[PDB]
Amino acid sequence: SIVGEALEYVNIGLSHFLALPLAQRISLIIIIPFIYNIVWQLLYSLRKDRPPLVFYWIPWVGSAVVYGMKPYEFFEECQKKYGDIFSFVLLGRVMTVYLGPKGHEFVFNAKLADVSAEAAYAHLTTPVFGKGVIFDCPNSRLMEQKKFVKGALTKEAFKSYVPLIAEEVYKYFRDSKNFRLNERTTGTIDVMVTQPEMTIFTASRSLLGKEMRAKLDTDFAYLYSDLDKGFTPINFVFPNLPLEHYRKRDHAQKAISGTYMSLIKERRKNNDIQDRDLIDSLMKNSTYKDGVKMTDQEIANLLIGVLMGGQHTSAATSAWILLHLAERPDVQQELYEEQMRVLDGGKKELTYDLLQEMPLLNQTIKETLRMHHPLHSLFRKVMKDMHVPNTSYVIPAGYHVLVSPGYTHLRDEYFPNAHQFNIHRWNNDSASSYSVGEEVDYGFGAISKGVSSPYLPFGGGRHRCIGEHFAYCQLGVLMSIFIRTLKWHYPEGKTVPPPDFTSMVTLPTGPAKIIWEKRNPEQKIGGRHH
Ligand code: HEM
Ligand SMILES: C[C@@H](c1ncncc1F)[C@](O)(Cn1cncn1)c1ccc(F)cc1F
Numbered sequence: 467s468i469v470g471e472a473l474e475y476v477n478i479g480l481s482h483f484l485a486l487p488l489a490q491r492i493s494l495i496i497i498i499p500f501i502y503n504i505v506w507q508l509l510y511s512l513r514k515d516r517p518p519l520v521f522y523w524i525p526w527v528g529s530a531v532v533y534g535m536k537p538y539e540f541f542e543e544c545q546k547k548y549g550d551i552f553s554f555v556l557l558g559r560v561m562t563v564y565l566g567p568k569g570h571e572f573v574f575n576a577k578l579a580d581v582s583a584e585a586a587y588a589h590l591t592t593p594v595f596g597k598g599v600i601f602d603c604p605n606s607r608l609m610e611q612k613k614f615v616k617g618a619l620t621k622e623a624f625k626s627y628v629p630l631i632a633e634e635v636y637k638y639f640r641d642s643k644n645f646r647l648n649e650r651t652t653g654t655i656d657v658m659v660t661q662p663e664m665t666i667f668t669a670s671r672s673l674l675g676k677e678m679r680a681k682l683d684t685d686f687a688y689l690y691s692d693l694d695k696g697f698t699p700i701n702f703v704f705p706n707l708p709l710e711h712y713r714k715r716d717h718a719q720k721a722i723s724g725t726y727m728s729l730i731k732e733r734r735k736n737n738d739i740q741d742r743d744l745i746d747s748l749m750k751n752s753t754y755k756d757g758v759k760m761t762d763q764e765i766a767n768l769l770i771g772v773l774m775g776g777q778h779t780s781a782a783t784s785a786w787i788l789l790h791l792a793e794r795p796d797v798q799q800e801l802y803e804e805q806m807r808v809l810d811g812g813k814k815e816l817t818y819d820l821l822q823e824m825p826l827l828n829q830t831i832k833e834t835l836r837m838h839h840p841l842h843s844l845f846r847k848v849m850k851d852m853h854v855p856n857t858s859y860v861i862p863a864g865y866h867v868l869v870s871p872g873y874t875h876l877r878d879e880y881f882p883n884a885h886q887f888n889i890h891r892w893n894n895d896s897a898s899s900y901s902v903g904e905e906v907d908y909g910f911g912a913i914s915k916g917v918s919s920p921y922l923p924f925g926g927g928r929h930r931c932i933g934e935h936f937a938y939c940q941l942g943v944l945m946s947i948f949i950r951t952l953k954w955h956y957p958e959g960k961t962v963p964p965p966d967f968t969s970m971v972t973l974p975t976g977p978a979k980i981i982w983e984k985r986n987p988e989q990k991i992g993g994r995h996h
Contacts, residue, residue, distance in 0.1 A: 499525045500523075500525060502525075503525040507519060507521060507522075514858050515858055515859060515860045516553070516859060516860070517548070517551040517552050517553050517562055517854070517857075517859050517861075518547075518548040518549075518551075518552045518553070519552070519553045519554065519555070519560075520544060520548075520552060520553065520554035520555075522554070522555055526555075526557065526558050527555075527557060528554060528555025528556050528557065528558075529554040529555060529556060530556050530557050533554065533556060534699075534967070534968055535967065535968065536967065537842050537843060537870075537967050538842065538870075538872070538873050538876065538967075541563065541565060541870060541873050542873075544563070545565055550564060550565040550566050550568070550569065551563070551564050551565075551569075551854060551857065551859060553865070557703050559865075559866050560864075560865045560866065561845070561865075561866045561867075561868045562848075562861050562865050562866065562867050562868065563867075563868045563869075563870065564854075564867065564868075564869060565870065565873060565874065566874055566920075567874065567918040567919070567920055568918075569869050569870070570869060570871055570874075570917045570918060570919070570922055570926065571916070571917055571918055572854065572855075572867070572869070573844070573846060573867045573868075573869035574844075574869060574917040574922075574925055574926040574927040574929070574930075575916075575917050575926070575927045576846065576852070576867070576927070578605060578928065579849065579850060580848065580849060580850050580852050581846035581847065581848055581849060581852075581867060582605075582846060582847045582849050583601065583605075583845075583846055583929050584600075584601035584602075584603075584604075584605065584608070585846075585847035585849070586845040586846055586847045586866060587601045587845070588600075588601035588602055589701070589702070589705045590697075590701050590702050590705065591771065593696060593701065593705060593706065593712075593715065593716070593719075594693060594696045594697050594701070594715065594719065594770075594771075594774065595719070595767050595768075595770050595771035595774070596719055596723055596763065596764075596766070596767030596770060596771075597763070597764075597767065598760075598761070598763070598764040598767060599611060599764050599767045599768040599771060600767075600768070600771045605928065606909065607754065609908055609909030609910055609928065610754050610755065610909055610910075611760075611768055612909070612910035612932050613909055613910040613911070614747070614748055614751055614752050614760075614768075615744065615747075615748070615768070615772055615932060616910050616911060616932045617747055617751050618673070618743065618744040618746075618747035618748070619932065619933070619935060619936050621818070624818045624935065624936070624939045625817065625818040625819070626742075627672040627818075627936075627939060628816060628817055628818045628821065628939065628943055629815070629816075629817075630668075630671050630672045631668045631671065631672055631939070631940060631943040631944070632816055632943050632947060633671075634664075634667045634668045634671050634679075635664065635668065635943065635944055635947045635948075636947065636991050636993075637667075637991075637993065638663070638664050638667055639947075639951065639991055640991040640993065640995060641995050642660070642663065644659065644660050644663075645982070647951070647984060647989075647990075647991055648990050648991055651983065651984045651987040652981065652982060652983045652984070653981070653982055654957070654979050654980070654981050654982075655979065655980060655982060656976060656977045656978060656979050657784075657785040657788050657789060657974070657978050657979070657980060658785055658973060658974065658976040658977065658978055661781045661782075661784045661785040661788070662777070662781040664781075664784070664944060665777055665780050665781035665784065665940075666682065666690065666777060666781075667679065667682060668940055668943070668944065669773060669776060669777060669780070669940065670682055670773070672743070672940075673743055673744040673769075673772075673773060673776075673936075674726075674743060674744065674745060674769065674773070675729075675742055675743040675745060675746075677729055678725075678726070678729070678745075681725065686721075686725070689717075689718040689721050689722050690718070690722070692714040692715060692717070692718035693715055693718035693719055693722060693770070693774070694774070695711055695714065695715060696711070696712070696714075696715030696716075696718075696719075697774060697778070697970055698969070698970060699968065699969070699970060719770065722766075722770060723763060723766035723767055723770060724766075726745070726765070726766035726769050726770075727762045727763060727765075727766050729745060730745060730749060730762050730765060730766070731762065733745070733746070733749060734749065744769065744772070745765075745769065748760070748765045748768065748769070749765070752765055772933070775933070776933050776936065776937065778840065778970060778971040778973075779840040779841070779933075779937065779971055780937050780940055780941060781973075782838070782840045782971045782972065782973040782974075783831070783834055783835060783838065783840060783937070783941060784941055784944055784945070785973060785974055785978065786834050786837070786838040786974060787830060787831065787834045787941070787945060788948070788954065788980060789962050789963065789974055789978055789980070790833075790834060790837070790887045790962060791830070791954070792954050792955055792956045792962075792980045793955070793956055793961060793962065794887065795953070795955065797830065797889060798949065798953060798954075800826060801826055801827055801830065801945075801949045802949055802950070802985075804824055804825075804826045804827060805824070805827075805946060805949055805950050808820055808823050808824055809950075812950065816943065816946055816947075818939065821938075821939065821942045821943070821946070824942070824946065825896040826889060826896075827942060827945060827946060827949075828896045828897075828898070828938065828942065829889040829890070829892040829893070829895075829896045830889045830945065831898075831938060831941050831942065831945070832889070832892050832896060832898065833887060833888065833889045833891065833892060834887075835923040836875045836881065836884075836921065836923070837875065837876070837885075837887060838872075838965065838972060839871060839872025839875055839923055839972070840971040840972055840973075841872070841971060841972070842870060842872045842873070842967055842972050843868050843869070843870050843872075844868070844869050844870070844871075844925060844929075845866050845867070845868055845869075846866065846867050847864075847865075847866050848861050848862070848863050848864060848865045848866060848867060849863055850863050851863055852867075871920075871921075871922035871923070871925070872972075874920045874922075875920070875921065875922075875923075877920075880920035880921075881920070881921075898924075898934050898935065898937075898938050899919075899921070899922075899923065899924055899934060901913065901914030901915070901916075902914070902916065902919065903915065903916060904916070908927075908928040909928075910932060911932075913926070913930050914926060950985070951984065951985060951986075951989075952982045952983060952984060952985060953982070953983050953985060954980045954981060954982040954983065955980065955981055956979075956980060956981070957979055957980075957981060960979065962974075963975045963976070963978045
């Protein structure tokens, strides 16, 4: 009755294994993790305290390809098979998705102790933005940064921003090669070229000021492009490796944060600190509640982060607005009439207050954000085991949770005929968003306590957007002027492009071209240009 002799053959087997020919060793080096992965998934499927796990063939990679390319189609199939809670493996991480309004509640209103945004995102954002801000700091520091930034985003600030943003749009119609309205009465444009440029010109001028805007007229502009390239999903898996892409990013962050710091120390030197812009505002208001001041480097870093985030969501969105309106001359006509009524045939100057009396214009923004949530997925890293209410499911620490309000935006259940563009579904409901009941303050002002609205373009809970009113102001001024100045349509045979879901925001697949025409071919934009 000896089993020790089997224990010998274990040792013998280990030794024969290590002496296999290389062609068999390498072969096993592949085949063993493969086989184990399959065996492990099958075993996992037995657990009742775990949501269903999407099956996958390639270890570590998981469902990355189909999630990367077609995430809403991936979610819809998964939802059909498993219901609203399911997991899937993604480049080494386990993502637990919770679709629908209950998922919105589960993730956006999760306790600070249970989940972490910075543990999910910092490896992406910190190299691009800089140290000490956003996700390179505790949540309570982020809470207060948002509060500081929000202090320059007031009604009175928006009133002074509107004419600056308008000036920038008109200058862009005047000077950009894409328009030249004093020289051309019609032309073709790629909206993925024009919208990122108009967005940076308008956001710089208003949030950063004239100096920083003037800088965009120089080679300095290319640093933003460089810094921009580092803001990609590839940094999500390979945040640092010695390629040139990574060094131009690092250099740009230094050069740009350097430029903001120079301005700041200049203003403080001359005591030229007023109430013009976000820089003025963070110079007067950036001391945390424990007495610690933000450094000039941290202020600069925060400016980069805020502008870059606001850059991509807004540029994506105005691109989509243009793209949906290009096959909807009926809606352009309707918007044009509202412009004529609110601005007295154009004899009134556009102001912030008049912007608020343009419901059809804001409804168009609202509907575009419904069909095109620029962030298709939001993540948190799970920090403690989470029990899913009314289920037997437990999400263990180390998993990630993924929420996707953009997906629910496209469901017929919540939005009848959700794939049709219809600004009138928001009739009598043109607010950018609104809390349906009770409110709470996490540090940056009172916001909706419930996050169960099927429409959640700005998220909710402690990580909620603070730029929505600035985005509406910017998009509003911009579209008010496009509409009053131009008509536009598609080249023959072209229609609304499909989304490119592989980028950081879900911009349209380019080239996305429209043909524009002056409503008033003889109208001229004044001012000087070289
Ligand atoms: C159409 C435009 C925009 C949309 C749809 C949008 C959307 C969002 C969403 C969904 C979040 C929540 C992120 C999460 O829960 O993980 C967020 C957060 C945030 N956004 Fe926006 N955003 C827009 C424009 C802007 C602009 C223009 C700014 C700045 C001027 C801005 C600044 C911020 C900041 C500072 C946060 C907080 C991040 C956090 O607490 O984790 N956003 N935004
Ligand atoms: C972290 C980042 C993000 N990017 C992509 N998928 C998910 C994300 F959370 C983002 O939320 C995007 N964003 C939101 N509003 C504008 N931009 C963000 C927030 C604050 C910020 F200062 C800069 C910034 F990029």
